[PDB]
Amino acid sequence: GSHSMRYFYTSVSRPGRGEPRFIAVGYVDDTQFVRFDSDAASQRMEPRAPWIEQEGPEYWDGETRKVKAHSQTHRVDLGTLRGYYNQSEAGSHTVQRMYGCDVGSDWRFLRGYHQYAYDGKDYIALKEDLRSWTAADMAAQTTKHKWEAAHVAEQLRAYLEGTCVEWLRRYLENGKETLQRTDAPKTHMTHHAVSDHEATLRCWALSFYPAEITLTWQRDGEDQTQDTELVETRPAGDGTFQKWAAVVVPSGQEQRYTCHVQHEGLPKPLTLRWE
Amino acid sequence: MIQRTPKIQVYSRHPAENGKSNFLNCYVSGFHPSDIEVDLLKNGERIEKVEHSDLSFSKDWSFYLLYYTEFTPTEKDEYACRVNHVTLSQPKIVKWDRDM
Amino acid sequence: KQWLVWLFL
């Protein structure tokens, strides 16, 4: 029932190569719906999901202007931070920004986020109360003082509790066939002789949405942690996700093992057995 | 300077069927910084016209990307993903296994 | 949609 909207921005400086590379993406839950790339020729925010293409020219002009502003402030920030930490001009550095909002099963506001990292390390972040900042070091403390003097957190809170959640609800309505759907996984088993006395059972979950899922093995009903192997959930490339879990078993004992599959799109968990 | 090694998975978008059109994927995740070299290899040869998703990152700020290409698997054609990164002194080659 | 901000670190 819960839902999320997130914007991710990354700026990487390119010393001796001109302007920093800037890439912005927007997600609703696990579905990307917008993208911007300073290297692309269009210089505009672009649709990545079908339900967002409905928006008219005012939407796209506004989002392009906003993402360009973010690009510009990030490019200023790269130099600002080089100064803060007294770093040379010859190396590459990375600024990342993320913000967004979470709503509950009733689509009411639940959480807000606004975070900055420098060189893969936390720099500054809006605290959970949406009223104050946490700073990772002294440079971030200068940023925090500047933002407190400008009352940034109040404007940010008004954005997160209004525009962010309101347009998330709009997207969830318009993209209902995509965002509000739960594709239960398509599961199957493969079997492979590893040696003349051992076998591998692999349990596949495919084409599920959203990405959260649980695969567990058990032997005669007892959870089987050891002799197993699971891969991280991975995108299929078409908006769905994949995962598998495998266990090595004595040949002739495959019937004792069961693969259990938990997913939101399943009314009850699935149980798969080889024989 | 935080540096994180990429995790790599090579896999097909659909379960492999010889003679059928499909998509070969190399998913790289958990790396920092964002600079990364990812190539898909057919029989050890670099494939051209390889596309990639838009750079994004996780809660711990580490990046992830999906590289993909249209292909048609056969019985005896070998596919792989080659990843180079500032954390990988030796480039990593991960071979494609249709059941993985 | 995004936040219309010119926020500098």
Automatic annotation (TrEMBL), chain A:
Principal location listed in the UniProt entry: membrane
Disulfide pattern: C101-C164, C203-C259
Organism this protein belongs to: Homo sapiens (Human)
Any one GO cellular component localisation term in the record: ER to Golgi transport vesicle membrane
Topology within the bilayer: Single-pass membrane protein; Single-pass type I membrane protein
Protein keywords: Disulfide bond, Glycoprotein, Immunity, Membrane, MHC I, Phosphoprotein, Signal, Transmembrane, Transmembrane helix
Similarity remark: Belongs to the MHC class I family.
GO terms of biological process kind: antigen processing and presentation of peptide antigen via MHC class I
Annotated compartments: Cell membrane; Membrane
Domain spans labelled Ig-like: 185-271
Whole-protein coverage range: 25 to 299 of 337
Protein name (record): MHC class I antigen
